[PDB]
Structures are given as structure tokens and as C-alpha cells.
Amino acid sequence: ARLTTDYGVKQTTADDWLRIVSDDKIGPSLLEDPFARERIMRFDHERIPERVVHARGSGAFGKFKVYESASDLTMAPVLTDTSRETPVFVRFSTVLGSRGSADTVRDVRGFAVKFYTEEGNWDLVGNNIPVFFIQDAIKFPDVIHAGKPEPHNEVPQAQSAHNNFWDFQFNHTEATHMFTWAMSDRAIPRSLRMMQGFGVNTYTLINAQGKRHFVKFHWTPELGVHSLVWDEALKLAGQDPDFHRKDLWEAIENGAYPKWKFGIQAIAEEDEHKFDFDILDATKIWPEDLVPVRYIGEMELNRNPDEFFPQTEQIAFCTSHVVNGIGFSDDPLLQGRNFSYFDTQISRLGVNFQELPINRPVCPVMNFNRDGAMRHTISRGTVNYYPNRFDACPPASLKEGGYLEYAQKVAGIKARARSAKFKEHFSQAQLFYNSMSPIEKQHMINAFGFELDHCEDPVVYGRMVQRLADIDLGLAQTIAEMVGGEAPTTTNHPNHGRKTINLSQTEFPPATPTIKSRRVAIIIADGYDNVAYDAAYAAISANQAIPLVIGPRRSKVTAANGSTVQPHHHLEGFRSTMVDAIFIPGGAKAAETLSKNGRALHWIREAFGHLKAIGATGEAVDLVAKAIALPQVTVSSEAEVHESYGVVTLKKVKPESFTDAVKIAKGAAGFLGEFFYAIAQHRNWDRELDGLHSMIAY
Amino acid sequence: ARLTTDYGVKQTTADDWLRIVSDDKIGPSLLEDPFARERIMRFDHERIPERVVHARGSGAFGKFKVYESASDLTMAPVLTDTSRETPVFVRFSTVLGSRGSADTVRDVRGFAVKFYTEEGNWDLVGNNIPVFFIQDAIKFPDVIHAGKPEPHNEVPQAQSAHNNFWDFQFNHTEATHMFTWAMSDRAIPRSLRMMQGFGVNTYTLINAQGKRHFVKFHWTPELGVHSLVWDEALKLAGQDPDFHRKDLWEAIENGAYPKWKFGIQAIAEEDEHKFDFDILDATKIWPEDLVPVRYIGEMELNRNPDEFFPQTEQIAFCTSHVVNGIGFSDDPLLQGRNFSYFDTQISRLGVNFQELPINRPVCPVMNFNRDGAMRHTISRGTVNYYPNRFDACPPASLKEGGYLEYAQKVAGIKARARSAKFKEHFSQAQLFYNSMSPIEKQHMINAFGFELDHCEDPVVYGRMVQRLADIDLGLAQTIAEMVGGEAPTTTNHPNHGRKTINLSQTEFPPATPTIKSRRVAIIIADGYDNVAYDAAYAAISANQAIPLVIGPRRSKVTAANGSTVQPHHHLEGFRSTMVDAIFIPGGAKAAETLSKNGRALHWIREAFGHLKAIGATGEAVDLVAKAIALPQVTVSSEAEVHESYGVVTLKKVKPESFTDAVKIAKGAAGFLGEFFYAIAQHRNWDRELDGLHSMIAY
Ligand code: HDD
Ligand code: HDD
């Protein structure tokens, strides 16, 4: 393999333009040089427009398969064939930020899946939140413009924390339910692998008998739904803007393929109007206590892209992409979406975008669509229209798999309006807030407090405080004292207190206790205990977690026993924000050095403040106890394992200390077991509920 | 003013698509609706390709004027007319990051100026660093591809901290001088208003007699050159990705128009070959001790854009844009640049980009260039070529202002090579490192340590450690112990120790002692001393600085005397990273509350760790002393003003405490004077030189 031009001509150098030159005097570059001009020309034109929304995203290849046929709901083979595996490509994303914006901002997350079925491409373009800000697609530009950077100065980037966003939220009550979800932990996921996915809009399924059902699609992570805490999310946005992209790529490269269960909520054609809300209103969820989610399949992502740009950047999804057996509903948000995903591709990619490798279906494509810019397909023949004398490219009958258009009855008048039930805008916002656990409510309170603090206009946060009273009077008061304004004492939208299942993240734990893919920092310094170090390192690896050694330097660290190791990173190059938990082995000399290292002390205090599991043995126990300096947090004093607020310690290490079985469960006996259990729980919320984080500086 | 379509037809609503609907049943949306389709279509196509490099940037309008004619060097009126003011638009930017990437990343900064002269548009497309990574433009794709996110996974965003960047740096020795500048504080400026600008390439100036001079252009900030510290820059990248954009916009909106002195280095045509280095080598600076910078003008930015997208996003600069009296040289980096700025616009904007308002010249444009997409110009006439029978649009003679092409002698052979002097690649890298102050060397050491730590390939950082020995043997050893690898004991490129002027940032202080535009946080809590508060607030404002009140809540805080104030932000919504210094007034109740507030304690510790000025009076003195907990940092014990490492205190406030004159100078007598002096010094470097920051957790 040797360097050539794009037209196949080998070149002797990639370092010099053709110019006039002499040993002692350089001259002008020549216009004739085709190799140099081509290099610069290709470079000059590398960029294409970013997606107008969901510009920042990461994707991977995988497979989908139903383990239970849904033939009673649809005759689409992708959802009825339990023997075939359907290839997919999934792209996750944020919404407001441009291409280089951070992964860990507060925002809705896109969850788009392209199913390459034998019957054509089916795209399920969803989000990680089940509802949306608006009911009619015509207002998408309004809500997006309001959330995006303000027009005059293009500030702020990838943030809803500014005047215009909250101005729109208050003035468009349809969005009430949505901004409540937006302030919840759902908007700051720990990993794209640890969040749900939803079709959001109401679609339809048609079976072999021609019977139709209205449906909602769900994706549920087998690792459970987990989130970051705000201070941590902001730091990561700067310290590692690719945190989620790397998290996904790393897991797949390591063989830890993320999985999601695929579920369907179905309402018979005949019961369309049997609910308080309109089942086609995208600002409404279908309470699972009324319509249960039926899980029938599983999807896993098992292969990273070969090259990001031609695959992840160029992939195009659209709600318009449905296969036989799957259809649309009169959902006024979905109706307009269908128009958009085709239209936008014309300028983003080009009219022949379906020819791009990543977008092409895996089955035969036959029609008379022709030409268009950058056309690769060459079609032989003298005819390109139907009907024609050769009966070339005839339509497919229904029995041959032709798309079935449900003959839905339609009656009414042409008008710019929605039906009666669409007028209800507060009930579910209250239901959602009511269903949140105490810690989740606290996180939402902190979110409103931070967001409205960043609103400079007293009219904006002042009005929002008034709106919050329509969700919960107590919430309004708390926010008012935090950001200003006056919380009303009454409301025309009383909150009756009802709650519902499967909304709180507490109802989505991992399929089984695990710490798979979690990152655990092992903090050391010269003189560390090689014993505790070896035990933890092996146990972390053996439980599919990632051990990351952090030391004062990234060259060599010497253990108390003389053995050495080269850490993955030094204390200044990484931060606790980048890991799930920290472990510090003993070693008097090591503990003393770390106790005088400000950066090291911060690692401990920040890990504590961010509610992460902390484990320490031997002399490191006093290190941690003194670093945190909280009487509420107790530690081991002898050879007994001790746990307090997710802080696991063992002061006196004995021969049996690391011989106990490693059981990831409540009330484990051994040190590693209890430490891993704290990690498996993700974060220690009691630490925050008891205000201990507020006492620490991090 | 009422809502209309783009074709002028008034509409009754922007909330509903035209559909089939009835009171109780919603129906499908109609295809016929032109208003809705237009809304979505315009939205779907809002984005255009981002700039291939310098995609993230901010700009403003301003004016330029020479106060000293350079008629001896050029006959270009823009540089000789001392009575006219030339309008300009300036766009600042980073280089590697995409559009939504953070402002405060470590990177070269773009400093592009478009001069709208009466003789045509002249663009000076420079950077905030005087040299570049390569000597020949043909390699721009190589260095840019190496620094940009790696192709397989598109990681990392806006960072040179990864394998490929350092792989190229080591393998292309021409870049040695440049990466040294890249690791200096120049790459992490505190504000776009506090950095220099350079043309980088060698241009030429031609005077009325036809005599030519080779030149270098310089921009020097009147506010001085100041930088952030790494931990702070990373936090800001996440906490406020628009930090620099907001800093620039705010200053201009407040009337604090940033100014730069414009200077020129000139070498007579006859002395082109009288230096050790080739004066056309862009990897070389012209030592100011050999060729002095002659300042002749001033530029100020005094007006923010009306709308970001059509102005800042669409503005196009190019080195090709030169006016009569200004020309090009055979600088092999400049030669290729000329080709690029025209080429890239074809896909980024469109062939008619010069028609866009922001790009149009302010003088008459007359030629036979025609048509092209989105053509607005309408030209009457039956002729569009020259020569023609009407002698329409004839050329301008030299006396009429026609562009003067210097008849430069050229002799040599056609070849892909550079001349002899271009082969020197290490001398100036050493000179630069040698010229840095102790603190600047320490910051560079920390930079290499952080950057190479983030290189996963032992071959990459291992080789770089070897390369560093070619700059300074001691530097290599220090980095080797920090990141790994083996520092060589010898080198074929000995560092002789010579230094030069005007390289260290210490040689670029503000024109006069000042704190103009600086932000000062005033931290309070219920029970604060209204006296110290009032005094500081007025003094900050009266010295053109910005007082930002930070409290436990953003609703109302009550002073010890019963008066109240609504802070700008609460402690959780902001961080010390966002301000230049902090001041805490007394009040026993306030100091006690803040002493138990972890977030508040962090504000103090972080401000200290980031080397920022800290001021406190009364009970707040003990608050600060205890928060920092360092014996090295002494504080006032009586009614005397005390200063220690930029920490200014006054424990016992007396009637005369705030009646002393406010003198921003070394050894001021009053509290505000010494506090403001600490602020004016930007940061307290002794704090870091003595390792005090290393003892604090922040
Ligand atoms: C009619 C306009 C409209 C409406 C009402 C929505 N969107 Fe949309 N969306 C677009 C118009 C759009 C778009 C402008 O056409 C985009 C960006 C560019 C592109 O390819 O598609 C897009 C992309 C886009 C993506 C990214 C696909 C990728 O990774 O490329 C996701 C996940 C969604 N949308 C999700 C949703 C959800 C869950 C919605 C609410 C039910 C929604 N969109 C309403
Ligand atoms: C031949 C290729 C090439 C070379 C050798 C350089 N650049 Fe360049 N630069 C481009 C090709 C380019 C470009 C690809 O044409 C860009 C981005 C898109 C655009 O409009 O111009 C650009 C933009 C661009 C901008 C942004 C203008 C704006 O704000 O829009 C600045 C400040 C510079 N460059 C500065 C420099 C400096 C100081 C260089 C070294 C002496 C340099 N460039 C070498």
C-alpha cells in the first residue's frame, strides 16, 4: 500500500507542495500541482451540516430478536419470527447541543434504532423520556428555538438553563408534564447503557386478520436505570465531554454488550376512547397500571463502527420508515414528524441518502426513483415508469407482502385544532412528581433551583414559580425561596396525590445484582499494601468491572513489599467524577503521603459528595475518616468489616480478610462483598437525604 | 406586526397543523397545508456546515485607526490615513473543536480581522501564537487530522490530549517550536480580550516608490496577556462552555470596549537572507531583540452582532484578501493558505458568499463575475466580458489605485522541497522554553504531564519523553517521572540557555494598573455586615469591575442591620471558577453559617487553589483562615490590613477602614487598595511556587 491521489496516481511525498526552489532560496508554490490541490480540496470540504436537533450522538451495531411472537398484534416478521435475528444500528444522542457539546449535559436523550429487516428498514426513532413538550408537530421549531442558544449571541450551549426555555415552558402549558421529566434524573443518565427508550408517539400494529391495535414501544435496560448527580455531570461535561461516547465504545470493545428488553403496550381499536386522556396525545403516558407493557424481545449492541463519520454521522432515521404490519396513528405530533425526517436529509446528506451503506436496506429495492446528486446506482433498461409495456417492476399484492394501509374511518372538518381531551395539561405532571421517590424529588428540586437561578429575567422565573404551584404547592414554595418570585398559596389545578408504577427509577433495578462495566479507581502511593491491592484488583476484574490504578505519578509506584506497578493515570490527570467508586489499600507510608496530598484528599471528598462507594483497608481507613471528617460516618476500628453510608472499611487486615466469598448482596460478610454491594447500588442516597454531602467541600 | 408565511400571507395561528378534526375525535394532518410545511421546511434546513477548523468562535464589530502613518513601508491608505477610521469585524475562535465545544479548552486561538477599507476588504487571519506546527501548507490535513478526534470513534473532542496528536508532534520535528507554545499558558487565555494576535506568516508591504519590505503583524492587548489555570479551565469547559463568548459580549455591552495596539516588524528587501533562520519560515519568530515591533495603530471592538448566525457564523475571511500596498511572500505555509479560504467557502457558504451582508465590501464592486447559486445582485447591460465595444468595466491603472504586483525575482527548479534554513527545527523551541518565567515553566510541565498521561500508547508518550530532551534535558526527566518512558541522558540538540524578550507573558502587563471588567464575587449569608458590603460594592463598581452577589439563596438575604438584598446567584448555581476574585464581608451570624456550608467552603478553597485574590473583613477573616487551614497563609488579627499570598484581610473594622484612598499599587495602605492590587495582578503565583495549592482539596 502506497500513497496515491484519489484518482490512483502514486505520489513520492506528502510533505511538499510543488514549487520553485533552490538550495538557498525558496520560491512560490505552483498552481499546476494536482496532488496538493486535491489534498487541500478534500480537506476544505470534509464537513456536512450537523443534524438540526440531536447533533451530538454516538452509535453502534447490534442485533434484535423476539423470544415471543406478537403475531396476535402484528404480522410483521421482525416482531413474529423468533428464529431470525435482525441486525440493527442504534444512535444515542442529546437534543439541544451542537456536535462538539458535552455528553453529560441535562437534556432529553435520543434513542434511535434502525432495524434492517428482510422486509425493509424499520426505524423506531425514540427518546429516553416517554412524553414530549408539545402535542402538535407544527410547534417543534418553537420549543427547539426556545431551548437552543438565544439568537442574538448564541448563548447558552446545550442547556435549558436560560430565559427563553423557561419562557416557553410557562406560556405553553402542554409542556408541563415534559419539563417535569426534564428536571428529573432521567435527563442526566450515568450511561446510555443505563436508560430506557420510548417510541413516545402512538403507533399501530396490524395482524394477519387485518385487526389493528394502538401501541407504545418500550426499551428497558438490563443494567437498570441509573443517573449522575448535577455537580458531577457539569464537571464531566468539561473534564470528559466524551464520557458517554467512551462508556459505550469501551463496554462493547470489552465484550460487555449492553442489552434492552423490548416491550409493547397495546390498546384494541375498539377501546381507543375509553380513557380520561387521548391515547394519541404525546404529552401523555399510558399508565402501566391501566395498560401493561408486554415484553417480547431483546436487543444488544455488540460492534462499534469501523469509521465514525460515514456511519454514525451519516446514518438517517425517520418515523416514515415502517414495515408492513406496523403503521401510524393520528397522533398530531407523529403526523408532522413523518414529513420532517425525509425533508431534512436533502440538505444534511443529499437526495440519494438511502444509497449510503449505513442507510441501505438489506433486501432488494426495486422502483423507478432515479437520478439525483451523487448517484451510485446504475439501472439497465429502457423503461423508468409504470405502467409500461414490459410490466416491469409491478406492485406487490398484499399476499406478496405489499404494505397494508389500514382503512381507518375519518370524519370531521378541516381545521387547525385538536380534540377535547387534548386540553388537559396538568394531571400527569402531578402524577409523575407524586410517583418520584424522596431522593428523586430532591434532585428535581435542585434542578429547578439551578435552572431558574440561571434565568436573568425576573418575569421568567417569577412566572415559573407560579406555574409550579399547578404541580405541587410545596414545590413552588421551596423553589421560590431558592430563586426568587412569590409562590401562590392556591391553585386551580389541585394535586390529589395519586401515584403510579414504573415511573420512579427505583422500579428499574438491574436484572440481577451486578457491577459489570463499572469503573473502580484504586488509589495508591509508594508504600501501598500489595495484599489488599492484589485482592481488590482480581475481584474487580473477576466481576467484570474495570480496575483503574491512580497514583501520584504515572511512571512507577512501589508497594511496601518492593513490588511495583505503573498506574493507569496520575492523580492530576483524572478525577473521581470519571469512576463509579474508589478503593484505597493500606500501607502506612502510602496513607501518610496521600493524607498530605490535596488532590488525593479531593478525590475522597468528591467521591463522597457525589455519593459514590468508597472502600478502604488498613491505614487507609484513617485516611478516609479524616478526609471526610464527619462523625456521622463511622469506620472500622478492628478486624471487623464496617459499612456506613456506602463507606466500607476494615482497619486491621487478617489472613481471612480476603478469603470470604464475594457476594453482592445486602448484609454481606466479607469486605469485598459489602464494598461491591455498595457499588452495585450505584450511589448511596442516604448520604444526601441526611445532608452529609452539604457538609463537605468538593 | 403579525405572523406571516415567508411569502407574506398572514396566519391566524402558529399552534395547529391543518387537519381533519371533530370535538371528540382528532384526525390526520393534511398534506395541502403550506404554512405548516414551510415552518418545518425552514426549520429542517437551518444548519450549514461548520468551519473545518476554528468551528467554535465568537465575534464583534469595531474600528481600527493608525495614529502613525506607515507610508514609509506601504501606500495602503488603511495603514497611512491617520484621519479615517476603518470599520472591522473580528472573530475569535479555538481550532480543533466542533461548534458546541467549550471556550476554555487548551488550544491555539484564532484572531481574525476583516478590515472594511475604502480600497476593498483586507483580512488579517491570525492566531494568538506567532508560529505554526508546519512549514508547508500541504501538511495542514495531517496536523489537523492528528489533533482532531480520532477517526474510528471520534474521540476526543477539542483536545490535543490523545495518541495521534503526540504521535505527529514527535514524528514531524518542524512542529517542535509550536507544541512548546501549545503547552504554555498562551493556549488557555483568561479572556479573548487578554491575548495577543499574530499574522504568523510573513507578508509584504509596498510603498509609493515601489520598495518592498517583509513584515510580521502583531496585536497587543491593552488589558495585558492573562491566562487560566488547568483545573479551572476544565471545570469552566463544563460549567460554562460559553465563558469566553459571554466575557466578550458582556464587556462590550457594558461599555468596556477591548483594545489592541497594532504593530509591524519590518525587514528590508535587501536583508532577507541576513538571519540564521529563513524569514519566510512560519515555524520561526523574528526575535524582537533583532527586529523590533513598531506600533502604529489601535483597534477596539465596540458593538456586538445583531444576530449570531447571519453574521458571526457566516463571515468568511481569507489570506487571499489583501488590498493594494499589502502583498504575499513565498512563505510556503502562506502560499497554500491563499488557495484554501476561497475553496472551502464553496461548500460552507456558497459561491456567492461575498454577497452576504457581513462579507460585502463597503466600496464599489465592478467586474464580470456572474450568476452562481442564490444570486442577489442584478446587473443591467448586454455585455459581461472584457474587452468589449463599450469599454465597460475597464481595468484600473496603478495611479488609479490598481493593485501593485511586486516584480519579485524568482529562480530555481520545480521541485517538492524547501531551502536550507528550513531544516533547523529545535533552536527556537529551546529559546521559548528558556524565556519562560519559573511559573510559566511549571505550567508547561503540568501541561505535558497531563497531555501525555492521556496518551494510552507507551510508544507515543515514550517517544515524546525522548523528544523533550531536545528542548531541555531537565524537562524530559521531570516529564518521564510523571508519565512514564525513559528520559535520555544526552541529546544531539544541546540547549545553550539563551533567552529573548517579549515571549514570556510577564512582559505584557496591562497598559496601566486596573481591574476593569474583572468579576468579583461578594459572598454573603443572613447576618452579613452591610458596611463592608456597601464599601466593597461601590468600590468595585467605581473601578469598572463587576460585583456579583452570591448567597445561600437567590431570593433574599438579610444583613445584620436589617437591610436586604437579592443575590445575583445562590452558592449552588455558580462557582468561583466563574469569577476573578472573591470578597466576604463580616457579620458573626453570616460567618458561622458559611463555615458550616460545604459549598461555601469549597468556593474559598477553590478560589485559593486557582490562585485568585481573596478578601475578607471582620468575622469572615476567621472563616477564610480556617477554610484554607494553612500556617503559611497569615491573616489580620487587629484593625490592621494584612496581605499574605494574595489573601487580604482586616479582622477589626474601624471607622477609617473604608476611608483610605483606593490605590491599585504595590504596598497600598487601605484594605480595598491592597485587595484590588491583588486582583489587578490577576493571580498570585507565589501561592503555587510555594506549593500551597497542592495542600488544598478543590
Ligand atoms: C416535525 C419535526 C419533529 C418532531 C415533532 C420531532 N422531531 Fe425528531 N428529528 C426531527 C424533527 C422532529 C428532524 C429535524 O427531522 C431530525 C434531525 C435531523 C434528522 O435526521 O432528523 C430529528 C432527529 C431525531 C432523533 C435523532 C436520530 C439520529 O440519531 O439521527 C431522535 C432520537 C428524535 N428525532 C426523536 C424524536 C422524538 C422522541 C420526538 C417526539 C415524539 C421527536 N423526535 C419529535
Ligand atoms: C491551506 C490550509 C490552511 C493553512 C496552512 C492554515 N489554515 Fe487557517 N483556515 C483554513 C485553512 C488553512 C480553512 C480550512 O480554509 C479555514 C476554515 C474554514 C474557513 O473559512 O477557513 C480556516 C480558518 C482559519 C481561521 C478562522 C477565521 C474565522 O474566524 O472564520 C483562522 C483564525 C485561521 N484559519 C488562522 C490560521 C493561521 C494563523 C494559520 C497559520 C499560519 C493557518 N490558519 C493555516
Curated annotation (Swiss-Prot), chains A, B:
What does the UniProt note on pH dependence state?
A: Active from pH 4 to 12.
**What are the inducing conditions?**
During prestationary growth. By ethanol and in the presence of air by heat shock. Inactivated by isopropanol and 20 mM 3-amino-1,2,4-triazole.
GO MF terms, alphabetically ordered = catalase activity; heme binding; metal ion binding
Q: Per its UniProt record, what Pfam families does this chain match?
A: Catalase, Catalase-rel, DJ-1_PfpI
Q: What is the catalytic activity of this protein?
A: 2 H2O2 = O2 + 2 H2O
Binding of heme: at which residues?
R51, R91, F140, R337, Y341, R348
Q: Can you say where in the cell this protein is located?
A: Secreted, Cell wall
For the biological process aspect of GO, one term held by this record is:
hydrogen peroxide catabolic process
What class does this enzyme belong to in the EC scheme? oxidoreductase
Which PANTHER family does the record associate with it?
CATALASE, CATALASE-B
Q: Tell me, what does this protein do in biology? A: Occurs in almost all aerobically respiring organisms and serves to protect cells from the toxic effects of hydrogen peroxide.
Q: Report what the protein is called.
A: Catalase-1
Q: Which organism is it from?
A: Neurospora crassa (strain ATCC 24698 / 74-OR23-1A / CBS 708.71 / DSM 1257 / FGSC 987)
Q: What is the lineage of its organism?
A: Eukaryota, Fungi, Dikarya, Ascomycota, Pezizomycotina
